[PDB]
Amino acid sequence: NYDGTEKIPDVMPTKIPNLLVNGSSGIAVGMATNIPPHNLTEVINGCLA
DNA sequence: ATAAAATCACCCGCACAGATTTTTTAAAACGCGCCACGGGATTTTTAAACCGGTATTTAACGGTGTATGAATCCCGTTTTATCTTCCTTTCACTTTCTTTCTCCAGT
């Protein structure tokens, strides 16, 4: 952490494709993102395919 | 000094609706000119009124069976009369800045 007295995970070991099913939206310097949500069953079927 | 409840400015990308701002275009206008058109004075011809008569074609009249016009009752629409308001304006007051007049200690 900032004081060097704790530990924080670098990334989560997720079982869910969260990015596609929930989307995202943010504004940065020189760029931006905009992603719509989706349906979980269709994403799972696509991953299996 | 402990409790209860509230409010606002800016940064970073991107897409779009709305508000100016040039730019182009069609209508209105002006000056000059010429010839198409209408006025005036003869020739010509034909549309309609007038006499017949005849042969149809219409309107006024007497029964039935409706469709609608005036009256009543409402509710959205638009006018008109009637309140409050923010900028213009001065203006007497207040405040604040600039120059001047002394004091005055020192030598």
Side-chain angles (χ1 to χ4, degrees):
Chain A
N1 62 334
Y2 54 93
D3 284 339
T5 59
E6 296 285 349
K7 290 294 184 178
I8 301 178
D10 182 71
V11 73
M12 292 298 185
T14 173
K15 287 184 172 62
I16 314 296
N18 187 28
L19 182 63
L20 283 180
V21 303
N22 274 332
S24 179
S25 179
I27 308 175
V29 179
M31 58 187 62
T33 175
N34 208 20
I35 300 178
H38 291 79
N39 189 88
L40 185 61
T41 305
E42 303 176 4
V43 178
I44 295 297
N45 294 333
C47 293
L48 292 178

PDB file of all heavy atoms in Angstrom, chain A residues 27-28 30, chain B residues 12-14:
ATOM      1  N   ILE A  27     -13.468   8.376 -18.172  1.00  0.00           N
ATOM      2  CA  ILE A  27     -12.852   9.473 -18.908  1.00  0.00           C
ATOM      3  C   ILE A  27     -11.412   9.615 -18.439  1.00  0.00           C
ATOM      4  O   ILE A  27     -11.151   9.686 -17.233  1.00  0.00           O
ATOM      5  CB  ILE A  27     -13.619  10.793 -18.716  1.00  0.00           C
ATOM      6  CG1 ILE A  27     -15.106  10.605 -19.016  1.00  0.00           C
ATOM      7  CG2 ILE A  27     -13.040  11.876 -19.608  1.00  0.00           C
ATOM      8  CD1 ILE A  27     -15.939  11.827 -18.728  1.00  0.00           C
ATOM      9  N   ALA A  28     -10.485   9.664 -19.392  1.00  0.00           N
ATOM     10  CA  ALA A  28      -9.071   9.824 -19.081  1.00  0.00           C
ATOM     11  C   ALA A  28      -8.483  10.989 -19.865  1.00  0.00           C
ATOM     12  O   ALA A  28      -9.219  11.752 -20.497  1.00  0.00           O
ATOM     13  CB  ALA A  28      -8.304   8.538 -19.380  1.00  0.00           C
ATOM     14  N   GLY A  30      -6.711  12.207 -22.945  1.00  0.00           N
ATOM     15  CA  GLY A  30      -6.416  11.795 -24.300  1.00  0.00           C
ATOM     16  C   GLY A  30      -7.197  10.601 -24.805  1.00  0.00           C
ATOM     17  O   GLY A  30      -7.061  10.255 -25.986  1.00  0.00           O
TER      18      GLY A  30
ATOM     19  P    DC B  12      -8.013  19.822 -18.017  1.00  0.00           P
ATOM     20  OP1  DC B  12      -6.547  19.639 -18.005  1.00  0.00           O
ATOM     21  OP2  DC B  12      -8.600  21.014 -18.665  1.00  0.00           O
ATOM     22  O5'  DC B  12      -8.687  18.528 -18.671  1.00  0.00           O
ATOM     23  C5'  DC B  12      -7.925  17.342 -18.833  1.00  0.00           C
ATOM     24  C4'  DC B  12      -8.815  16.113 -18.823  1.00  0.00           C
ATOM     25  O4'  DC B  12      -9.867  16.277 -17.857  1.00  0.00           O
ATOM     26  C3'  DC B  12      -9.560  15.827 -20.115  1.00  0.00           C
ATOM     27  O3'  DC B  12      -8.723  15.094 -21.024  1.00  0.00           O
ATOM     28  C2'  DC B  12     -10.742  14.972 -19.627  1.00  0.00           C
ATOM     29  C1'  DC B  12     -10.830  15.286 -18.122  1.00  0.00           C
ATOM     30  N1   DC B  12     -12.184  15.761 -17.704  1.00  0.00           N
ATOM     31  C2   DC B  12     -13.058  14.867 -17.080  1.00  0.00           C
ATOM     32  O2   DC B  12     -12.677  13.713 -16.852  1.00  0.00           O
ATOM     33  N3   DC B  12     -14.293  15.294 -16.721  1.00  0.00           N
ATOM     34  C4   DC B  12     -14.666  16.546 -16.980  1.00  0.00           C
ATOM     35  N4   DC B  12     -15.897  16.920 -16.608  1.00  0.00           N
ATOM     36  C5   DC B  12     -13.795  17.471 -17.628  1.00  0.00           C
ATOM     37  C6   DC B  12     -12.577  17.036 -17.975  1.00  0.00           C
ATOM     38  P    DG B  13      -8.780  15.381 -22.608  1.00  0.00           P
ATOM     39  OP1  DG B  13      -7.389  15.468 -23.096  1.00  0.00           O
ATOM     40  OP2  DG B  13      -9.704  16.512 -22.828  1.00  0.00           O
ATOM     41  O5'  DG B  13      -9.466  14.069 -23.227  1.00  0.00           O
ATOM     42  C5'  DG B  13     -10.836  13.807 -22.965  1.00  0.00           C
ATOM     43  C4'  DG B  13     -11.378  12.672 -23.819  1.00  0.00           C
ATOM     44  O4'  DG B  13     -12.703  12.344 -23.358  1.00  0.00           O
ATOM     45  C3'  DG B  13     -11.602  13.009 -25.274  1.00  0.00           C
ATOM     46  O3'  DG B  13     -11.805  11.799 -26.008  1.00  0.00           O
ATOM     47  C2'  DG B  13     -12.884  13.837 -25.194  1.00  0.00           C
ATOM     48  C1'  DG B  13     -13.645  13.143 -24.057  1.00  0.00           C
ATOM     49  N9   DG B  13     -14.246  14.068 -23.100  1.00  0.00           N
ATOM     50  C8   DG B  13     -13.737  15.272 -22.678  1.00  0.00           C
ATOM     51  N7   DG B  13     -14.484  15.873 -21.799  1.00  0.00           N
ATOM     52  C5   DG B  13     -15.558  15.014 -21.622  1.00  0.00           C
ATOM     53  C6   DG B  13     -16.692  15.135 -20.788  1.00  0.00           C
ATOM     54  O6   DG B  13     -16.979  16.059 -20.016  1.00  0.00           O
ATOM     55  N1   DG B  13     -17.540  14.041 -20.910  1.00  0.00           N
ATOM     56  C2   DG B  13     -17.320  12.965 -21.733  1.00  0.00           C
ATOM     57  N2   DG B  13     -18.253  12.004 -21.714  1.00  0.00           N
ATOM     58  N3   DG B  13     -16.260  12.836 -22.521  1.00  0.00           N
ATOM     59  C4   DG B  13     -15.425  13.896 -22.413  1.00  0.00           C
ATOM     60  P    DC B  14     -12.241  11.834 -27.555  1.00  0.00           P
ATOM     61  OP1  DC B  14     -11.784  10.568 -28.165  1.00  0.00           O
ATOM     62  OP2  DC B  14     -11.796  13.121 -28.130  1.00  0.00           O
ATOM     63  O5'  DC B  14     -13.844  11.833 -27.512  1.00  0.00           O
ATOM     64  C5'  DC B  14     -14.547  10.670 -27.080  1.00  0.00           C
ATOM     65  C4'  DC B  14     -16.050  10.844 -27.243  1.00  0.00           C
ATOM     66  O4'  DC B  14     -16.568  11.720 -26.207  1.00  0.00           O
ATOM     67  C3'  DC B  14     -16.500  11.450 -28.573  1.00  0.00           C
ATOM     68  O3'  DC B  14     -17.643  10.757 -29.051  1.00  0.00           O
ATOM     69  C2'  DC B  14     -16.842  12.889 -28.197  1.00  0.00           C
ATOM     70  C1'  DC B  14     -17.393  12.699 -26.795  1.00  0.00           C
ATOM     71  N1   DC B  14     -17.337  13.925 -25.952  1.00  0.00           N
ATOM     72  C2   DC B  14     -18.329  14.152 -24.993  1.00  0.00           C
ATOM     73  O2   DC B  14     -19.243  13.328 -24.867  1.00  0.00           O
ATOM     74  N3   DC B  14     -18.259  15.271 -24.227  1.00  0.00           N
ATOM     75  C4   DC B  14     -17.252  16.132 -24.396  1.00  0.00           C
ATOM     76  N4   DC B  14     -17.221  17.221 -23.620  1.00  0.00           N
ATOM     77  C5   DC B  14     -16.233  15.916 -25.368  1.00  0.00           C
ATOM     78  C6   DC B  14     -16.314  14.811 -26.114  1.00  0.00           C
TER      79       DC B  14
END
